[PDB]
Structures are given as C-alpha cells and as structure tokens.
C-alpha cells in the first residue's frame, strides 16, 4: 500500500528542484508510466523511495510509514525494479539465481519456465555451475530476474529503452501475464503497454502533467498523451 503527501522533489545531489507539489494515494493492482521531454521520469521515483538521490520537500509513503523512520535496509531492498543494462555475475546460475538464501528447483524451473527460460535449462545442465546470445535471452534472463522478486511492488521504468522491439513480443507479453495483481509502474517511450494502466505520467512544466487512465486521457477533447501521440 502506498500514500505521498505533497512531493516536492529537490536535489541536494545537483542543481535545483524537478519534481513539484505532487500527493495522491496509490496501491497496488496498477500501472504507472513516465513520458515527457527529458526522460526517466520514473527514476525520480525510484532514486526517492529507494533512497538512490534525495528530494527535499513532500514524502512518498509505504503503509502508515512515511519516509522518515522507514527501514533503510528494508526500503532500498524489499522492492524490485529492471533496469536497461542491469547483466549480474555470469559465474553460476543458480547462485546468482540465489543472491538471497534460496530459491533451488522451486523458483528455479518455476520462474525459468516462466520466463521461457527453461530451454537454458533444457541447453545448459542443472546450474550452479555463461553462454551470451545478444541481450535478448541475456537481458530477458536478466528482467525474468528482477520479476522474480515475487512481492508485491515490481518497478520497471524504460526497461524497453534498449530491449529492442519485438522482443517485448514475448517479452511485453510475459508481462501481460505477470505485471499484473500487483504494485506497478511501467514506463516505456514507447508507451505502448501504458494502455490499460490506471495512471499514467508525462512530464511538461515543472512536474508530470497529469495523472489518469489512458482512455480517460484520450476521451478528452485535448489531453497532453494525446498530443504526444502523434509524433512518436
């Protein structure tokens, strides 16, 4: 579960403010995605709550906790995400597989079936024990990975960026049956698994512009994900 009251992102890192004056409760079962001019959108969201940058005013708030005394080892850890470039140790499968304590068999021909990664269990014998095939398997491997998490909030933002194209052909589609009964929010230039999302984010002015679902958006007369439509 998920409650922000009155965001206001500012960087101590690097110069000045970007994100501005944004509250709103939000729980799971949702899809939020991040458009705009200049990109990662999401990644505000992520280096916030999972303490990467910092922001100055407003918090983003788990449970009845907010930012402040939240678990540090717990908010940076007990979330998920996917990243474009984010390849682990190629030394053994099943152990970085177990990054944490295990998983085994279990999750190991559970999640690799599920990713259709059961042929790598079909190829390469039981694991422990890496053969690269552009990032496609790579990289899908690697995605599976991060929705392995298993929990209730998965993050991904432009996790498509470099995954090339039909890729998400599977790849999308491994997600139209997982992203799914869960805390999500997928971003993508593409945008085009932002459909069915219940919010969605594009950032003009100062901040996001709005907040609401796709078709709600395009129902209006003018709506700015509209108007970025076209010229994509």
Same mark, same amino acid.
């Given at each position: 579960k998920? !409650? =922000?009251?009155n965001?206001s992102?500012r960087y101590d890192?690097?110069?000045?403010?970007v994100?501005? &004056?944004? $509250?709103?409760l939000?729980? @799971?079962? *949702?899809?939020i995605? =991040?458009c705009?001019?200049t990109?990662?959108?999401k990644?505000?969201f992520s280096? +916030?709550?999972?303490?990467?940058?910092d922001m100055f %005013?407003?918090?983003?708030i788990?449970?009845?906790?907010d930012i402040a005394?939240? @678990?540090? &080892?717990?908010?940076?850890?007990r979330?998920?995400?996917i990243?474009q470039?984010?390849?682990? #140790?190629?030394?053994t =499968?099943? #152990? $970085?597989?177990d990054?944490?304590?295990k998983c085994?068999?279990?999750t190991l021909?559970e999640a690799l079936? =599920?990713?259709q990664?059961?042929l790598?269990?079909?190829? /390469?014998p039981?694991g422990?024990?890496g053969? $690269?095939?552009? *990032?496609g !398997?790579?990289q899908?491997?690697?995605?599976?990975?991060? #929705?392995?998490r298993k929990?209730?909030?998965?993050?991904?933002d432009?996790?498509? +960026?470099?995954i090339?194209?039909a890729?998400? $052909?599977?790849?999308q589609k491994v997600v139209m049956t997982?992203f799914?009964?869960?805390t999500?929010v997928?971003? +993508? &230039?593409?945008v085009?698994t932002i /459909?069915?999302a219940?919010?969605?984010?594009?950032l003009?002015?100062?901040?996001?512009?709005?907040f609401d679902? @796709? %078709?709600t958006?395009?129902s !209006?007369?003018?709506?700015?994900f509209a108007? #970025?439509?076209?010229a994509?």
């Open positions: 998920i !409650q =922000i009251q965001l992102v890192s690097s110069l000045k403010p994100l501005k &004056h944004v $509250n709103a939000i729980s @799971p079962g *949702q899809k995605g =991040i705009g001019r990109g990662s959108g990644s505000s280096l +916030a709550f999972f303490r990467m940058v %005013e407003g918090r983003i788990i449970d009845g906790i005394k939240l @678990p540090l &080892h717990t908010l940076r850890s979330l998920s995400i990243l470039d984010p390849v682990l #140790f190629s030394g =499968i099943r #152990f $970085n597989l990054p944490e304590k085994s068999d279990s021909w079936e =599920i990713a990664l059961k790598v269990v079909k190829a /390469l039981g422990l024990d053969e $690269n095939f552009s *990032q !398997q790579r899908l491997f690697c995605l599976a990975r991060a #929705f392995v929990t209730s909030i998965f993050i991904m432009e996790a498509t +960026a470099s090339d194209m890729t998400e $052909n599977i790849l997982a799914a009964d869960r999500v997928t971003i +993508a &230039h593409r085009h /459909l069915s219940d919010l969605v984010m594009v003009k002015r100062g901040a996001i512009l709005e679902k @796709p %078709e958006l395009l !209006q007369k003018d709506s700015v108007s #970025f439509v076209r994509d």
